[PDB]
Amino acid sequence: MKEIDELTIKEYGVDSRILMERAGISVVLAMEEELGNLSDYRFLVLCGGGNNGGDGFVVARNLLGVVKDVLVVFLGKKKTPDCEYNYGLYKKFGGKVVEQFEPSILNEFDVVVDAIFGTGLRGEITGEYAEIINLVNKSGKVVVSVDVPSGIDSNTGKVLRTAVKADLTVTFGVPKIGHILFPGRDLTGKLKVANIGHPVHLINSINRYVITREMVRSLLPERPRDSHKGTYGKVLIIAGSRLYSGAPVLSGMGSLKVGTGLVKLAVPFPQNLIATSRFPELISVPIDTEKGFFSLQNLQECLELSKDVDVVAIGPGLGNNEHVREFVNEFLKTLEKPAVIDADAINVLDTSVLKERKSPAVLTPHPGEMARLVKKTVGDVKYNYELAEEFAKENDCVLVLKSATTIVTDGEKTLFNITGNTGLSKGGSGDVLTGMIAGFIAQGLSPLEASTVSVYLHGFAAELFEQDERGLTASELLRLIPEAIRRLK
Amino acid sequence: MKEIDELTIKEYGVDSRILMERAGISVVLAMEEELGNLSDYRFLVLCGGGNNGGDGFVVARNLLGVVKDVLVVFLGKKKTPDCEYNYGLYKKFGGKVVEQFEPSILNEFDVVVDAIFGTGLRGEITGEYAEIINLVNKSGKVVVSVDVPSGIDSNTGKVLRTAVKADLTVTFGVPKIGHILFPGRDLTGKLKVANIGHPVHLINSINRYVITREMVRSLLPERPRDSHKGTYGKVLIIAGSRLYSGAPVLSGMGSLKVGTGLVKLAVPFPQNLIATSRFPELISVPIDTEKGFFSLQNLQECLELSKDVDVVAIGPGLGNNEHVREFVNEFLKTLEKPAVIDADAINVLDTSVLKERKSPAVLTPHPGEMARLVKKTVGDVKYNYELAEEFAKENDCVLVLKSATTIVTDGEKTLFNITGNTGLSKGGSGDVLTGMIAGFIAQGLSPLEASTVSVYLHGFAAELFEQDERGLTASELLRLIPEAIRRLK
Amino acid sequence: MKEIDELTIKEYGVDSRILMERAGISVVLAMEEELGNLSDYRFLVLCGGGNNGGDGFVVARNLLGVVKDVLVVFLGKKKTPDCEYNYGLYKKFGGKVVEQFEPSILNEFDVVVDAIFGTGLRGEITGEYAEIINLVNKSGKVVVSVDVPSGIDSNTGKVLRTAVKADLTVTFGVPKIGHILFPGRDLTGKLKVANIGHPVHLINSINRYVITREMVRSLLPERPRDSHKGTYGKVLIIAGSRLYSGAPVLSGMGSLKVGTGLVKLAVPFPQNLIATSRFPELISVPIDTEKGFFSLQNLQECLELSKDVDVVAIGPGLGNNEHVREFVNEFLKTLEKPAVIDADAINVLDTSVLKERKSPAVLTPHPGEMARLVKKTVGDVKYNYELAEEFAKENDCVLVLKSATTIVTDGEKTLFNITGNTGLSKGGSGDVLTGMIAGFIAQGLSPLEASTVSVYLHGFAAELFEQDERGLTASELLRLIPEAIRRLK
Ligand SMILES: CC(C)(COP(=O)(O)OP(=O)(O)OC[C@H]1O[C@@H](n2cnc3c(N)ncnc32)[C@H](O)[C@@H]1OP(=O)(O)O)[C@@H](O)C(=O)NCCC(=O)NCCS
């Protein structure tokens, strides 16, 4: 968007002052939408010397004569030209500016407008900026942040030593990565994205996206009336072990609940019988194993089972030992079908295999699994969308990096999912999503499309749970999938 | 509270007469709140010679001129000074006092105010006091008890030969143990605790507590949005046998339904497969046993399974034989994790093991199990909160002594739970609570906090069952846990 | 009530401290009833050195530990014993007292409790008490007055140089005259009268009363089913002139709307025809006059018309000239029926006539008319209930002194009416009330009873008007009378 503002001024010829005026009035309107009538409130506007501060002076000026009181505290040592222009207007209109933040000043105001730093912040916040931000956060006032809460790195969502906790953030043109990834997402509060007059073509030239309800609705496959089960695809799920007998069942029902026609599971005997006792609509093939885990002796049978399906999911509950590792890698190297690779299949995966496959794959790691896959620390991979993009491009796959905000990428397009809640931070949730992705691929969506629709619907289903989210289990999530689909439509 | 009244008079300087006036007016207001307008009712006030009787004279005097009729029957042979003072006022205001209870007098009155004995009662009630109390209980009149129903031992809740059955009890400052433990709890009817002017500091210096909704709400852990399953803890449940295959499943789901991230069960094969057939989100590890019960040969495996969890629960459905006893005690002596110890693990427990553990423990006996643990009779341990406190202090543990009123103590603080109903008097209920406690410990609550929140939520869930409580089963209780959490919030 | 408190302590033996405690707790409960939960508010308690201040210390002490903050500002130079006692308790309980009112202290509090002066105030408030009261009134805080707003003379309702404007006033035992007469009535805000333990016999020995709905309901006459018009009385109204043709009509309908059986008007021809054109149920007898006003030539006819009625009303719209004066006085001296004397009949009345009548009379002056009748200024008679009582006793009549608060007295019992609104400050309103009084006398109520019921119902009817009260007219008031009667029942 730094690019976007510059082209809009330099190539399109929109005066920088017009963009700044539109930015500020949009904050005023946003506030009115959340607070109702503004005339009873007293506003403290905290302005930096940059263009975020300039936007703050526009806000402040537009409140003059209309609200109970407005004061600007200017916290800068110099002003960008647009900030200087809007400072001068604020003062010409009769506005009061002070240059020293006295901690008790907070007592006399209802709303704090945070226009200290925007996307221009670089480096840790120190000194008196930090003391001020901390005082605002302890004040209990309503906080409205201009563009991004001050102290959030707009490219990453990390806190730069400290940051404002906003009730309402008003950003311009498009959301920033820092609104979408945590901790930034938490500090943003309610986000409104304001149209401030950039050409719609430039706004739409962005290559990273938030997954929206309208996007998912347009990707949901068609259900032709004259269909039969094969119309809706066939999935094989290779999953489970004597240790982990539940995973197959959750993956399988995840495929069925999204509309897949036929789902079969290959599960070590007698753990395969667990699935049909719970959901007799599943096909749960018994696999004769030596000690309760898949091994190379099961390679040929699993390849034969794969011949008559559209997609294969592998990994949930397989276990991780050397014999599973041999099986997984040899299977994936030979399988000429799309694969969804999760859990223990990721843990044992040789990435060389991904490079040599002709068929597509989707990988669904959490950050612990991603860290192991690229031999890095969890902190180095968590919310690292550039790493994810590089990995997907280098390995010719779709990568679905699960977290509260889920990143989906094929290395060219990257999508961020914000549906869900903490009830999904519980064993079994990932197994459901794996089945969902395979099911949608089986119905004819591309690996990327299937991943996009699935992460959104999985999170939206969680949110439809009727009692406290901490009590949500994967079994209940399964029941909520068709409701999420209905509500989406 | 004997202490509380004395310090309030002697150190704070509040006249004893002021406290007694406040006590009596609080009974009047309480009655109005339950009966509506008092002017249509005829009141029979039964006064002893102590301060409870004095409170009764205040009630009676305050009804004069405002209700249809008031009569006091004075049943004492002498009067405390405050009782004498309020007797004289009652008579000066025109009140009628008789000194002989004629059984037919009950016919002419609507409400009986029981001010015979309060917390001053010592020893069995005999003679004419007993005949009177029995006549009141056969009368079918509305009964309001001042402080405690006469005949209840306020320290224990036991009936002292006979006691008044009250519709409404109005007590002063704080509830008494006798309101909270049975049979006293039953005889109290609806309880109101009136503020009669003790300093809030003295009221708050009490070391025993009733577990309230506000206490539990403040202890419920946080659900940070940017979480993953490990944020919410990991539990291992060592449970079950060839005899008792259901217990593990109920304990495990009890952990999951309270928001725990990961739950694994160690259960003798093939009984472990029962769990995942019902709830495939559980991990149910098969343990190779000789004859269907844990023994020392499973010690090393269970220790290895414990390395990657936060808390271990042990006991439900283990069975009780010598080989289980060897396993339990050796496991607990070696385990360096918090333990929740229930059921058959309590039955075989060597308490020496508790003393030598560095890690904490919570024990969850019913009175039969407690009796066996301390080698006493059920009657000697039931509702024996002092024994429970001594046991917890001596063994460095939290003790959760289950009954209709549940006692939770670490030997310094003692909490009483009054949520629940008789649907919990059924097999499986305790197994659920064990999982709940372990789950909350795994989420970061202290053993005492986890026990407090769990007993309350377990009982409150029971009360949310929509049909007759006698039909409640543990499976339905599990379903109701997240609703109890929602309602609590 | 000074008497009442003293007898309750000295004869009945209630400790003065008990009465003061009950007074203060009643203010707390009253506040809770109006503000809801008190725990979120910060209270500033302003205490004088008298017993009102003592009551304030009780309030303050009872808020300690339960609300957000409590501060007492003590504004006195010495303390009554009970005030000293409750000051010491407040401090022992940890309460903060300051002895200097800093104007900015108001900023830190939500509720001001006014316990500066009660019924003990004598003389104009000067100096720093006045500055404080004025600051409280400019503060916009919620104000609760203990007993009476400080600065109101509790015997008269006059402001003693300045006074507190309360949102809520809590008084003890009975309302004071100062709550009922203006300006005091305005400054009182919402009034609650608290029972603080005086014997009901002493509370009921008061000889002045507020007219209540229950009193009026018990006085409303019976409507036996087997009745006929004569059962419900007959009224003659002597009223009107060529100047004032509407008055008769309003008086007449006032009698009919309260249930009178027969109403006839004697009105100068042709103004008599106005009445039946509007309400043909009236009998409107034409009286042949010389120049449009009653005179002595009409004396005999009016006496004949009076023979067959129960009550005669005279005065509305008669005009005031010498010939009307001759007629009125000679008529009233000869008439041996109860008379209701209003308006121009009062203006020309010789009070010697009242003394010599054997039959009763009710007089209904406004303060201008009363002033003329006793040859005093309006300021000397307005709300002067002692003058009214003396006048009624000396002249053997009921006096109904109309104003926003209406005084009704026969010289032994005095009643205050507080129903009504400013829509009654408009021509025609008084003419309606005159008809109402005559009607009720005709139905068998005593002059005093009829006056009591009428003033209440007249005011209550005004309040039932559905649109803005300033638009109420006498015609609409007439329509609302039967609704007031229904609502009363
Ligand atoms: C203009 C833009 C290209 C980036 O620069 P900018 O907007 O001026 O940047 P900000 O207002 O966020 O902040 C810049 C100021 O932050 C402060 N700053 C940055 N890092 C800091 C640090 N860690 N410690 C202290 N101060 C720091 C400085 O005051 C800095 O200027 P300075 O370093 O010369 O002192 C653009 O991305 C932008 O923020 N505008 C958004 C669009 C908009 O607001 N709409 C229209 C108006 S142009």
Ligand SMILES: CC(C)(COP(=O)(O)OP(=O)(O)OC[C@H]1O[C@@H](n2cnc3c(N)ncnc32)[C@H](O)[C@@H]1OP(=O)(O)O)[C@@H](O)C(=O)NCCC(=O)NCCS
């Ligand atoms: C399943 C089992 C292996 C536990 O593993 P797990 O918790 O699922 O471990 P994972 O590979 O899935 O990785 C979890 C890690 O990924 C990372 N992680 C996952 N999601 C994350 C996110 N959103 N953000 C940050 N970190 C995240 C964290 O580091 C997490 O560690 P933590 O749980 O300690 O916080 C184990 O309980 C079991 O089922 N079997 C026990 C068998 C055994 O090993 N011993 C006995 C022999 S039979």
Ligand SMILES: CC(C)(COP(=O)(O)OP(=O)(O)OC[C@H]1O[C@@H](n2cnc3c(N)ncnc32)[C@H](O)[C@@H]1OP(=O)(O)O)[C@@H](O)C(=O)NCCC(=O)NCCS
């Ligand atoms: C005062 C207090 C310290 C304890 O003593 P108390 O209140 O006078 O005691 P009670 O009114 O319950 O009863 C005392 C009387 O009970 C009766 N009594 C006790 N046991 C009895 C027995 N089993 N058989 C017959 N009578 C018995 C007696 O009449 C006894 O006095 P007595 O033994 O000398 O004859 C205090 O705990 C209390 O009960 N007051 C509660 C607080 C209160 O009421 N608010 C303010 C007023 S002080």
Ligand SMILES: CC(C)(COP(=O)(O)OP(=O)(O)OC[C@H]1O[C@@H](n2cnc3c(N)ncnc32)[C@H](O)[C@@H]1OP(=O)(O)O)[C@@H](O)C(=O)NCCC(=O)NCCS
């Ligand atoms: C489970 C089994 C052992 C029955 O035991 P149980 O009822 O659960 O016995 P517990 O140890 O739990 O103790 C129950 C006692 O505790 C006490 N108790 C529990 N809660 C109490 C409370 N709230 N208040 C008072 N007493 C209480 C009572 O004494 C109760 O006895 P009661 O049921 O007779 O009234 C048995 O049915 C079984 O499952 N297996 C049978 C195996 C066998 O022994 N024989 C065949 C060989 S295979």
Ligand SMILES: CC(C)(COP(=O)(O)OP(=O)(O)OC[C@H]1O[C@@H](n2cnc3c(N)ncnc32)[C@H](O)[C@@H]1OP(=O)(O)O)[C@@H](O)C(=O)NCCC(=O)NCCS
């Ligand atoms: C006690 C009672 C007989 C009258 O006296 P009182 O209550 O102490 O009087 P108040 O509190 O209203 O005020 C007395 C004080 O007002 C102040 N005062 C009166 N007129 C004043 C004036 N115009 N200028 C300054 N101060 C004045 C004084 O401080 C005076 O005492 P002081 O003249 O010796 O300095 C009684 O009518 C009363 O007010 N109590 C009501 C009942 C009650 O409160 N319930 C129970 C408690 S007793």
Ligand SMILES: CC(C)(COP(=O)(O)OP(=O)(O)OC[C@H]1O[C@@H](n2cnc3c(N)ncnc32)[C@H](O)[C@@H]1OP(=O)(O)O)[C@@H](O)C(=O)NCCC(=O)NCCS
């Ligand atoms: C009716 C007419 C005489 C006006 O008189 P009125 O306002 O009704 O005068 P009243 O006798 O009723 O007395 C009103 C006074 O009583 C007092 N008053 C009434 N109620 C009061 C109360 N509640 N509190 C205080 N004062 C009150 C006031 O002093 C009031 O005076 P104000 O209206 O100036 O404030 C006149 O308009 C008229 O109808 N005819 C005009 C004839 C004339 O005189 N001249 C032409 C010759 S034909």
Ligand SMILES: [K+]
């Ligand atoms: K900002």
Ligand SMILES: [K+]
């Ligand atoms: K009692």
Ligand SMILES: [K+]
């Ligand atoms: K006052």
